C-alpha cells in the first residue's frame, strides 16, 4: 500500500514476502551476488613446474648436511608455492525462487521505513542536475541519505550524477545488494512496480 | 584460619575467602578459638564464651595467576588463567 509522486494510488497490489523480512535469505542472496561478480585472477606459480629451474642438483649421498632434488621446490626460496591460488570461478546458479523471493523481500524490507514510487519524471526539464536537487528537496530528499533511483527515461536518470546523493539502476536492472546497500530506494517508474 | 575466623587479632583489617552474603559493612560475627588478650590466655571451649565481631570492608578479586601444565614428548601443554575471589573483613570485636 504505497503512494506515488504524481497521480494515482497503488501498491495495495503485491503482498510482501512471508515471513516478513527474513534476513537469512537476504544474506544468502547478496553473498551469492558478490560471489557472482567475483573475478578470479590468480598469480601463483604454485607448481614446482611453473617457475623456471634446471632440475638435477648435486648429490643424494656424501655431500653432507642437505638432501635436495631441485632448486624449484616449495621448501626453497624462489620456487613454487604449495597450494597457491589459481584462476577459479565461484559463479554458480542460485535457485531462482530465492532470487525472486530475495528482491521482493528487499522491497518489503523497505516497508518498515521509507520507500518511494513515482510517476511524471518530466519535472526534471532536461537534466541540469540542479533540477534533480530540486525534485529531491521538494520530495523530501536532501541527500543526507543514500538513494537508489530506479527508472527508465534516460533523460530523467541522466539528471542524477554523483556518488553522494544517489546512484542509478535503469530499466528495472534491480539488484538486491544495490537496493539493500543504499539508504533509500526510490522506485520511480511504476513499470516493474505493480 | 581454616576458613572463617578464629583466635585473636586486635583491631586489624584482613582478607578472607568469599564471605557469602555481600554488604558494605554488612556485619559479620565470629565465635572464638583462643585469646591472648587482657594478658590472660585461656584455651578453647572457654572461647565459646567469647565472640569477636568484624565489619566487611570490600569484595575483592585476587592477584591473577596463570595455570600452566606440561607433559613431555606427548605434546600436551596447557594454559589457563585463574583469580580466586575474596572479601575483606575489618576486625574489631569482643
Amino acid at each position: 500500500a504505497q503512494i506515488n509522486v504524481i497521480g494515482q494510488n497503488g501498491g495495495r497490489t503485491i503482498e510482501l514476502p512471508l515471513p516478513e523480512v527474513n534476513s537469512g535469505v537476504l544474506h544468502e542472496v547478496v553473498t551469492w551476488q558478490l560471489a557472482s561478480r567475483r573475478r578470479g585472477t590468480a598469480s601463483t606459480r604454485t607448481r614446482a613446474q611453473v617457475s623456471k629451474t634446471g632440475r638435477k642438483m648435486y648429490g643424494q649421498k656424501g655431500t653432507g648436511n642437505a638432501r635436495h632434488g631441485d632448486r624449484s621446490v616449495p621448501t626453497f626460496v624462489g620456487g613454487g608455492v604449495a597450494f597457491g591460488p589459481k584462476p577459479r570461478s565461484y559463479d554458480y546458479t542460485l535457485p531462482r525462487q530465492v532470487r525472486q523471493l530475495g528482491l521482493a523481500m528487499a522491497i518489503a524490507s523497505r516497508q518498515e521505513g521509507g520507500k518511494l514510487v513515482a510517476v511524471d519524471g518530466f519535472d526534471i526539464a532536461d537534466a541540469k542536475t540542479k533540477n534533480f536537487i530540486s525534485w529531491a528537496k521538494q520530495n523530501g530528499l536532501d541527500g543526507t541519505e543514500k538513494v537508489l533511483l530506479v527508472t527508465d527515461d534516460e533523460n530523467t536518470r541522466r539528471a542524477a550524477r554523483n556518488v553522494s546523493w544517489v546512484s542509478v539502476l535503469p530499466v528495472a536492472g534491480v539488484n538486491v545488494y544495490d537496493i539493500l546497500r543504499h539508504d533509500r530506494l526510490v522506485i520511480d517508474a511504476a513499470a516493474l512496480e505493480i | 584460619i581454616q576458613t572463617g575466623g578464629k583466635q585473636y587479632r586486635v583491631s586489624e583489617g584482613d582478607v578472607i575467602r568469599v564471605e557469602s552474603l555481600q554488604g558494605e559493612a554488612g556485619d559479620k560475627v565470629e565465635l572464638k578459638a583462643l585469646f591472648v588478650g587482657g594478658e590472660q590466655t585461656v584455651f578453647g571451649e572457654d572461647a565459646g564464651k567469647y565472640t569477636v565481631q568484624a565489619e566487611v570492608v570490600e569484595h575483592g578479586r585476587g592477584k591473577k595467576i596463570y595455570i600452566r601444565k606440561y607433559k613431555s614428548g606427548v605434546q600436551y601443554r596447557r594454559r589457563t588463567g585463574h583469580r580466586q575471589n575474596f572479601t575483606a573483613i575489618k576486625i574489631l570485636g569482643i
Binding site: 537469512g24 544474506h27 547478496v30 545488494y177 539493500l180 546497500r181 | -
Partner: protein, 94 residues
C-alpha cells in the same frame, strides 16, 4: 543495511586447518600416509571370486501411470497422450 545483515545460523562451519593443533600431525602414524592410491574397490576381495554372468539387455521401459492418480482427484480430463504433458506425468523418452 548490510552491516546488520547476519548469517544463516549454521549454514557455514569453518573448514579444517591442520597447521598447528599442537599434537596434530594428521592421518595415521605410519604406513599409508602420503599416498594417492587408497581406492576402496579392487580385484580378489569378494568381488571377483563371485560367480555371476547373467545376460545384459535392458530394453524397452514404460512410463508408469498409476490408476490411483487418475481416479480420485482431478476431472477425468479424458487423458489421451495430450494432457499427460501438463498432468505432471511429463517425462517422455519412453
Amino acid at each position: 543495511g548490510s552491516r546488520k545483515d547476519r548469517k544463516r545460523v549454521g549454514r557455514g562451519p569453518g573448514g579444517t586447518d591442520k597447521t598447528a593443533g599442537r599434537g596434530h600431525k594428521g592421518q595415521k602414524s605410519r604406513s599409508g600416509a602420503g599416498k594417492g592410491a587408497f581406492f576402496e574397490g579392487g580385484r580378489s576381495r569378494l568381488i571377483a571370486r563371485l560367480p555371476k554372468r547373467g545376460f545384459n539387455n535392458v530394453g524397452t521401459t514404460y512410463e508408469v501411470v498409476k490408476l490411483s492418480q487418475l481416479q480420485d482427484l482431478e476431472d477425468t480430463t479424458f487423458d489421451r497422450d495430450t494432457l499427460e504433458a501438463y498432468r505432471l506425468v511429463r517425462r517422455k523418452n519412453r
